[PDB]
Amino acid sequence: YSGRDSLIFLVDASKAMFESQSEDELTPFDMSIQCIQSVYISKIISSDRDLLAVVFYGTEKDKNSVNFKNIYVLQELDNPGAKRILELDQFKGQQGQKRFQDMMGHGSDYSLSEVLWVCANLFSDVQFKMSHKRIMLFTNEDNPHGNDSAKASRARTKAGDLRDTGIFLDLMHLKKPGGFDISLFYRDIISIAEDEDLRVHFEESSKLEDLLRKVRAKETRKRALSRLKLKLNKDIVISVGIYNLVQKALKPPPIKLYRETNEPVKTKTRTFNTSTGGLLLPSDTKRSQIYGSRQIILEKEETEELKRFDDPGLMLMGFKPLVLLKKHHYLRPSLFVYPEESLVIGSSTLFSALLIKCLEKEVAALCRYTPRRNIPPYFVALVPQEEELDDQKIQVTPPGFQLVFLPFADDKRKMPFTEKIMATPEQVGKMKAIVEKLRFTYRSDSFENPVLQQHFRNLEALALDLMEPEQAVDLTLPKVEAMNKRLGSLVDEFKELVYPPDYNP
Amino acid sequence: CPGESLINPGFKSKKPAGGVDFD
Amino acid sequence: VKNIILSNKHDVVKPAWLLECFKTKSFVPWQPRFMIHMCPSTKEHFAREYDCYGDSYFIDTDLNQLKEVFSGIKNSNEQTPEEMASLIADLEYRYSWDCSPL
Amino acid sequence: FPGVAIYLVEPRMGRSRRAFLTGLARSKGFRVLDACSSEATHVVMEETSAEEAVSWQERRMAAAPPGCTPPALLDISWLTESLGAGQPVPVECRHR
Amino acid sequence: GNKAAVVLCMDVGFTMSNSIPGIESPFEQAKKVITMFVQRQVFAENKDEIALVLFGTDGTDNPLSGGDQYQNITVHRHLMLPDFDLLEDIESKIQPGSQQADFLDALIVSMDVIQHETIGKKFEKRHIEIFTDLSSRFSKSQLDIIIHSLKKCDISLQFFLPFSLFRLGGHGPSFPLKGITEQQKEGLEIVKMVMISLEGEDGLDEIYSFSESLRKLCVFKKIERHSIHWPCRLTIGSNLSIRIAAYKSILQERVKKTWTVVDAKTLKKEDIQKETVYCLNDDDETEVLKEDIIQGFRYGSDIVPFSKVDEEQMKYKSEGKCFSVLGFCKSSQVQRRFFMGNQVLKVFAARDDEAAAVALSSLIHALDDLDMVAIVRYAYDKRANPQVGVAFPHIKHNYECLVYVQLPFMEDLRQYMFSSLKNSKKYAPTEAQLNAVDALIDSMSLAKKDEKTDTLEDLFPTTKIPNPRFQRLFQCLLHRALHPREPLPPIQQHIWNMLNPPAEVTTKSQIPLSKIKTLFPLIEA
DNA sequence: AAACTATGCATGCTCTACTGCTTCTGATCTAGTCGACT
DNA sequence: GACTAGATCAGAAGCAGTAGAGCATGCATAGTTT
């Protein structure tokens, strides 16, 4: 996946879209606006490098690069921002609905071929490389050109041309009084038609709920941290890329702005002699270390040379049984090693053979790791990983090697001496009962970082000028109420068995 | 490809964090 | 605005103050009506000149000004029907308000 | 050395740097004028090209009296050398 | 605070200079070990007293010189902070002698020095290390009082010998058998009995060798200080609570001393100044005071201001120092590959607390029996960001505790898709390739199945090896200090040897590697 | 015996360099159209 | 010839992640004073 993502929102502006069947139900136009705003927010948080556009068709006024009638391009393909979100929200309310009607109009003839043509023109106007070209059609009508067949053929031809070009189109059908029949006219326009999505739809599209589900997490495309070299011998060599399947999430770095005008300010640093008052360079400086009364002076190049043992890469040392790899011997997050094949040919077969043989023998490959030049070597273990996929053939664990850092002697610390005190069988049984009561299934993505979520919510409130920032419920709390209600009298019995009455913990 | 994230093509959809759900 | 209010180091003023200043083309003194927040220095300054509510001690009050003053004070339920009626009667008697028709 | 006058170009080397250089020169016994004047004889440049130097010279001459001696265009290296040696170092081609 | 005193007894006898061809004499190995110890104790900037006593020299200088006793023993350096002078004495101005000295007499002198110099300052850890080859005549008359005084004075004793109970630190046999002498055997028996009497069947673990000591950090085993304890309360609900103390079992070690930038000529820090300035994005380069800068954040195509006070007011807040057990999950559901953080915590019961110890032991035993781990919430203090981690039991005959390791959040997981290798047809290895890989794996095995106990013994344990960067830095600093004008020396041979596997695997992995090379076509592209 | 002060440590924050990967941009080679010439 | 187009390949900016340095600050524990 190389390039950017392009999304164009097509919101129909017919009379039927501006009417609500039942009370306490937002009109389809407002629902589309909210969905667009949610998508904009999700794109801003996850990846702001993508391009989003908003185009309205069926309006009285027209604004297009070709001067097509009855089409308005509210926002051209550009990176999302708070200004576009506010502009969309301006039409959110009923007063916003009136403003949209006054400044845009509604209830005019339109051609699907025309909107597809303007969308294609917008796509062709992007100078950046687009990995995905997508269009979303928000419309509750299923038979727009029911009074004319030539327009239907023109729309079919335009949709076919867009499909051939590589444009991927979706129809976000909304609620209709009578019902939505995709099989009537839109079946031949959607890029992919599902067999299930054939019956008449009397409710909202399921995609709308997914779109409205805001996601707050940065999405990073696949990228190799380093294309290192694995050397089984001074002559045998292969190339392997290193990836970080797990990486700590940090909030975006702050930026300095000028209070008076709120503009970026450049930060610079300089070094000069207090006597000569002239600029100095790193090559005109020495590093000093004072131990007691003695002073030791070394050049910067010498200090860099201090931590130089071997060239960057991985050097094989041997194979060790997996039983000898302690679970508690953890120092840094593990990495993933996968064959590259873009540098040396024939490495993939060797990697596969090594993986299968290590899995059969249950042996991890011990190696010396030097991620970069002038970096002290470390001892790492590569444990083979078996490609694991859950139901419906979705991968959950890729095949390769898991690189785990083995702590050195210095990294280990000695604990204070303690006297063992065995627990009686009754107390162990009570604890077993408590644990069984508090049983729960764990998954890798069952918790959210409260700090990052709160920061994102605060930034959203600041940018959109919202009244207050919606408090983010944190799942990291132990919800003591439910645990107490579930345990019952087990805690009291355990305290009586273990804790003496005159303890007061 | 069921489960693909509509917002972010090429990224699998991720279920909302359910926290601790006792059995 | 809420964050600025919480940090008691600045004064929050309604836009109406600036509009009135433009209307008269002059610097108009502050009033509690225009002030959404009051810094401790400004709060002390207003305490001496102005009542805790949006009412003044020196400059008299008019119909509109008294209406705004009454708007600022929110209804409270520390009174009782019987004691409230007794207080109203005492107030009318003290200032000779027995000539009212109602 | 009251006879010799030295001036600095504020809008091309910052404010803190200019203040530090002025303080160092004053401590060294060199008089630095806060505001540009005809009495200035030496002007120090910093990270600038010849075209901008001649533009600055033209701008200065545009508001200077005739029959005078515009200060010679001189670089920061000279000032650093003079401060290090404690006395005005002779000017050579590089500074000019 | 905390302080310790160490006495290093070094043999200087003629036998110490003996060296078999192709091997380094024991004198060089002892000098290297003592130099490493002194470098660690001096460059670490720790308040520790070090004294050096040389026995076997031509001269005699010690307090016990009233009569003709304890001859050929010199107290080279008394109990004082280790300065560079000790390093110079160790390196250059110390040469082997020719007159033998009694090991027992040297131990007597060392013990007397420890007793006499332990009057001014207070020491809570007294250690004596004896470096000798056990090739000199000795008398056992004073042995009984030696043991009595060692037991009474609470003095730790360590021994270093050229051989254990060829390359330095090669993870292989040293001093091949059938070379030890009868006198060496007798001395070994005496030291073994002394160590057994002192440590009580553990003394055999305190008799190391120079080759092993160079790569085992054994010299500082009794000197290193225990880390502080983090107290907290493990709460399962709103009522149950167990007082616990957490220590940092594993944490990456980094040099604390930081390089200081100084002027090239005067070699002084005062003549260097680093200044930070801010300017607008304009050619004029307008200057702005540090107090006219506001923090802000990028929201995509625009930047929204976010004042520091506003951020502090609106930042997530939680109660500090919380250790709550969110729940219990099967150990299989938690995998090592998802482990996060840069530290591992060991949680024990509160010290001198019987009820807390019993409760923690019961919890650990229940978790072990049920094969479960505890998903818990951990926060060092108010400022520390809350973390979700996994605590699992760790039961050993010596002690039992919990091991806590941080777990990843839903935002810290990367979803990368990798092409399958099992079903791939373009990279399907042949049977011969698999056989060659199997042979290579078998030949390069680093673990041996000892049939005496039917146990796996590790021939190349990388966890016990010290970090070579610290030793390299100390060596280079010492070389620069002793020789102010000279290029830095190369990496020590023993450092390379300890970072390489035993020669047995290298020799046994030649034919398999050749078969792999000939059966696998590899070419750069 | 209790209150105040001292050191000591840990963790999160900020900056500056360093290296490696990905995407955008500027310099360099040819098809077509008009024109010049013999 | 001339030019403008078109394509096409080599260098620079941005990003991500790591290490090394210096500090905020609060939570614990050892020492001194009333």
Strand F contact at CB of residue A178, distance < 7 A: no
Protein-proximal positions, strand F, CB < 7 A: 7-25
**Cβ–Cβ under 8 Å, residues A142 and A173:** yes
Angstrom distance (rounded) from CA E221 to CA E202:
14
Å: A286 CA to F19 C1': 23
Angstrom distance (rounded) from CA A80 to CA E302:
9
- What is the dihedral sign for C-alpha E111, E113, E118, E124? negative
Coil/strand/helix, residue A134: strand
The method recorded for this entry reads cryo-EM
Selection from E298, E253, E286, E195 nearest residue E44 by Cα: E253
| Exposed/middle/buried for residue E451 (C-beta within 10 Å: 0-12, 13-18, 19+) | exposed
D–B contact: 3+ Cβ pairs < 8 A? no
∠ CA C35-C38-C41, nearest 5°, is 135
Q: In this complex, which of A246, A478, A483 lies closest to E414 when CB atoms are compared?
A: A246
Protein-proximal positions, strand G, CB < 7 A: 16-22, 25-29
**Cβ–Cβ under 8 Å, residues E411 and A448:** yes
Instruction: Note whether A276 contacts D20, CB cutoff 8 Å.
Output: no
Angstrom distance (rounded) from CA A10 to CA A122:
12
D72-75 and E4-11 beta bridge pairing: unpaired
* Contacts with A41 (C-beta within 8 Å, 6 or more apart), sequence order: A85, A214, A460
Å: C85 CA to F8 C1': 70
Residue in chain C lying closest to E312 (CA): C3
* Contacts with D86 (C-beta within 8 Å, 6 or more apart), sequence order: D28
Angstrom distance (rounded) from CA A358 to CA A349:
14
Q: Is the CB of residue D13 less than 8 Å away from at least one CB of chain A?
A: no
Distances, alpha carbon A66 to alpha carbons A71, A117, A169, in Å? 10, 10, 22
Distances, alpha carbon E345 to alpha carbons A408, E147, E249, E354, E505, in Å? 17, 39, 6, 22, 36
Q: Is the CB of residue B10 less than 8 Å away from at least one CB of chain A?
A: yes
Q: What's at E344, amino acid-wise?
A: V
Selection from A396, A454, B9, A272 nearest residue E273 by Cα: A272
For the stretch A159-195, what's the b/e string if a residue is b when 16 or more beta carbons lie within 10 angstroms of its beta carbon? Answer: beebeeeebebbbbbbbbeeebbbeebbeebbeeeee
Angstrom distance (rounded) from CA E515 to CA E430:
13
Angstrom distance (rounded) from CA D78 to CA D94:
9
| Exposed/middle/buried for residue A387 (C-beta within 10 Å: 0-12, 13-18, 19+) | middle
Angstrom distance (rounded) from CA E158 to CA E218:
9
Coil/strand/helix, residue A487: helix
Strand partners, A318: A366
**Cβ–Cβ under 8 Å, residues A135 and A168:** yes
Angstrom distance (rounded) from CA D23 to CA D31:
10
Distances, alpha carbon E195 to alpha carbons E158, E199, E200, E201, in Å? 9, 6, 7, 8
Coil/strand/helix, residue E20: coil
Q: Is the CB of residue D44 less than 8 Å away from at least one CB of chain A?
A: no
Instruction: Note whether C7 contacts E314, CB cutoff 8 Å.
Output: no
Distances, alpha carbon E225 to alpha carbons A415, E208, E220, in Å? 10, 21, 10
Structure tokens given for C75: 């209804």
Strand partners, A370: A313
Residue E207: its H or E element: strand E207-209
Å: A223 CA to F21 C1': 7
Query: How many Å is the Cα radius of gyration of chain C?
Result: 18
Q: What's at A171, amino acid-wise?
A: L
Question: How far is the alpha carbon of B1 from chain A, nearest alpha carbon, in Å?
Answer: 9
Angstrom distance (rounded) from CA E12 to CA A441:
67
Q: How many residues does chain C have?
A: 102
How far from the centroid of its chain's Cα atoms is residue A164's Cα?
Answer: 30
Selection from E388, E238, E235 nearest residue A480 by Cα: E238
**Cβ–Cβ under 8 Å, residues E48 and E4:** yes
Token look-up 């002030």 returns C35
Angstrom distance (rounded) from CA A354 to CA A365:
9
Q: What's at E81, amino acid-wise?
A: L
Strand F contact at CB of residue A283, distance < 7 A: no
DSSP-assigned letter for residue A48: T
**Cβ–Cβ under 8 Å, residues A143 and A186:** no
- What is the dihedral sign for C-alpha A474, A475, A477, A480? positive
Coil/strand/helix, residue E346: strand
Structure tokens given for E516: 């792999």
Instruction: Note whether B12 contacts E415, CB cutoff 8 Å.
Output: yes
**Cβ–Cβ under 8 Å, residues E174 and E24:** no
Angstrom distance (rounded) from CA A104 to CA A85:
18
Å: A3 CA to F23 C1': 8
Angstrom distance (rounded) from CA A408 to CA A377:
11
Angstrom distance (rounded) from CA E321 to CA E377:
10
∠ CA E141-E144-E147, nearest 5°, is 130
DSSP-assigned letter for residue D57: H
| Exposed/middle/buried for residue A337 (C-beta within 10 Å: 0-12, 13-18, 19+) | buried
Residue in chain A lying closest to B21 (CA): A440
Give me the half-sphere count of Cα atoms (radius 13 Å) on the Cβ side of residue E102.
14
Angstrom distance (rounded) from CA E184 to CA E189:
9
Å: A221 CA to G13 C1': 19
Neighbours of E489 (CB within 10 A): 13
Q: What's at C27, amino acid-wise?
A: F
Å: A122 CA to G1 C1': 39
Q: What's at E505, amino acid-wise?
A: V
Angstrom distance (rounded) from CA E395 to CA A183:
66
Structure tokens given for A339: 């064959």
Tell me how far apart the terminal alpha carbons of chain C are, to the nearest angstrom: 47
With beta carbons under 8 A apart, name residues in chain A contacting D79.
277
Angstrom distance (rounded) from CA A321 to CA E324:
36
Distances, alpha carbon A51 to alpha carbons A74, A142, B14, in Å? 14, 28, 22
Question: What are φ and ψ of residue A463, in 5° steps?
Answer: -70, -45
Question: What are φ and ψ of residue E401, in 5° steps?
Answer: -165, -170
Strand F contact at CB of residue A264, distance < 7 A: no
Phi-psi region of B9 (alpha: psi -120 to 50; beta: other; left: phi over 0): beta
Instruction: Note whether A275 contacts D80, CB cutoff 8 Å.
Output: no
Strand partners, A336: A243, A402
| Exposed/middle/buried for residue E382 (C-beta within 10 Å: 0-12, 13-18, 19+) | exposed
Q: Is the CB of residue B21 less than 8 Å away from at least one CB of chain E?
A: no
Angstrom distance (rounded) from CA E28 to CA E35:
10
Residue in chain A lying closest to E304 (CA): A463
List residues in chain E touching B: CB distance below 8 A.
Answer: 326-327, 375, 410, 415
Q: What's at E491, amino acid-wise?
A: I
Question: What are φ and ψ of residue A39, in 5° steps?
Answer: -65, -40
Coil/strand/helix, residue A354: helix
Distances, alpha carbon E11 to alpha carbons E143, E158, E183, E236, in Å? 19, 14, 16, 59
DSSP-assigned letter for residue E284: T
Q: Which stretches within E56-132 are classed as H helix?
A: 84-91, 103-117
Q: What's at A157, amino acid-wise?
A: T
Strand F contact at CB of residue E92, distance < 7 A: no
Structure tokens given for A218: 């940065």
Distances, alpha carbon E231 to alpha carbons A499, E399, E478, in Å? 19, 19, 41
With beta carbons under 8 A apart, name residues in chain A contacting E303.
255, 257, 262, 264
Angstrom distance (rounded) from CA E426 to CA A14:
55
E260-262 sheet: strands from edge to edge: A294-298, A286-291, E260-262
For the stretch A109-120, what's the b/e string if a residue is b when 16 or more beta carbons lie within 10 angstroms of its beta carbon? Answer: ebbbbbbbbbbb
Q: Is the CB of residue E310 less than 8 Å away from at least one CB of chain C?
A: yes
Structure tokens given for B21: 């759900």
C–E contact: 3+ Cβ pairs < 8 A? yes
How far from the centroid of its chain's Cα atoms is residue E393's Cα?
Answer: 25
Structure tokens given for A434: 């408590």
Angstrom distance (rounded) from CA A90 to CA A33:
10
DSSP-assigned letter for residue D3: T
Angstrom distance (rounded) from CA A271 to CA A494:
66
Q: Which stretches within D2-75 are classed as H helix?
A: 16-27, 50-62
Distances, alpha carbon A469 to alpha carbons A452, A456, C2, in Å? 14, 10, 12
* Contacts with A476 (C-beta within 8 Å, 6 or more apart), sequence order: A447, A448, A450, E326, E377, E386, E388
Å: A226 CA to F22 C1': 13
Q: Is the CB of residue D19 less than 8 Å away from at least one CB of chain A?
A: no
Angstrom distance (rounded) from CA A348 to CA E521:
11
* Contacts with E451 (C-beta within 8 Å, 6 or more apart), sequence order: none
D42-45 and D72-75 beta bridge pairing: parallel
Distances, alpha carbon A362 to alpha carbons A154, A319, A323, E297, E333, in Å? 63, 10, 9, 49, 20
Question: What are φ and ψ of residue A204, in 5° steps?
Answer: -70, 155
What DSSP string runs through A180-233? Answer: B-TTTTGGGTSSS--SSTTSPB-S--HHHHHHHS---S-------SEEEEEESS
Instruction: Note whether D14 contacts E287, CB cutoff 8 Å.
Output: yes
Counting as contact any 3 or more CB pairs under 8 A, the partners of D are A, E
Coil/strand/helix, residue A403: strand
Strand partners, A54: A9, A75
Angstrom distance (rounded) from CA A198 to CA A184:
10
How far from the centroid of its chain's Cα atoms is residue E459's Cα?
Answer: 19
The beta-carbon contacts of E287-290 under 8 Å, at least 24 apart in sequence, are E287/D14, E287/D15, E287/D16, E288/A258, E288/A265
With beta carbons under 8 A apart, name residues in chain E contacting C6.
313
Helix/strand number for chain D, H first, E second = 3, 3
E340-349 and E400-406 beta bridge pairing: antiparallel
* Contacts with E296 (C-beta within 8 Å, 6 or more apart), sequence order: A254, A255, A256, A257, A262, E303, E304, E305, E306
Spell out which residues of A between 221 and 240 contact strand F, using CB within 7 Å: 223-227
Question: What are φ and ψ of residue E43, in 5° steps?
Answer: -75, -15
Angstrom distance (rounded) from CA D73 to CA D75:
7
Q: Which stretches within E76-175 are classed as H helix?
A: 84-91, 103-117, 143-153
Å: A112 CA to F31 C1': 38
How far from the centroid of its chain's Cα atoms is residue E460's Cα?
Answer: 16
Selection from C61, C3, C4, C6 nearest residue C32 by Cα: C61
With beta carbons under 8 A apart, name residues in chain B contacting E327.
20, 22
Instruction: Note whether A278 contacts D17, CB cutoff 8 Å.
Output: no
E strand residue ranges, A67-146: 71-78, 130-138
Angstrom distance (rounded) from CA E346 to CA C5:
46
Angstrom distance (rounded) from CA A458 to CA A45:
12
List residues in chain C touching E: CB distance below 8 A.
Answer: 3, 6-7
Coil/strand/helix, residue E218: coil
Angstrom distance (rounded) from CA E253 to CA E461:
19
Helices A82-89 and A28-46, interaxial angle, to 10°? Answer: 170
Strand partners, E349: E244
Token look-up 């009136």 returns A98
DSSP-assigned letter for residue A393: G
For the stretch E347-356, what's the b/e string if a residue is b when 16 or more beta carbons lie within 10 angstroms of its beta carbon? Answer: bbbbeebebb
Angstrom distance (rounded) from CA C41 to CA E275:
37
Q: Is the CB of residue B12 less than 8 Å away from at least one CB of chain A?
A: yes
Structure tokens given for A3: 């390039």
Task: Specify the nucleotide whose C1' lies closest to residue A224 (CA).
Answer: F21
What DSSP string runs through chain C? Answer: -HHHHHTTTS--B-HHHHHHHHHHTS-PPP-TTTBS---HHHHHHHHHHB-SSS-BSSS---HHHHHHHHHHSPP-----HHHHHHHHHHHHHHTT-TT---
**Cβ–Cβ under 8 Å, residues E513 and E501:** no
Angstrom distance (rounded) from CA E47 to CA E81:
7
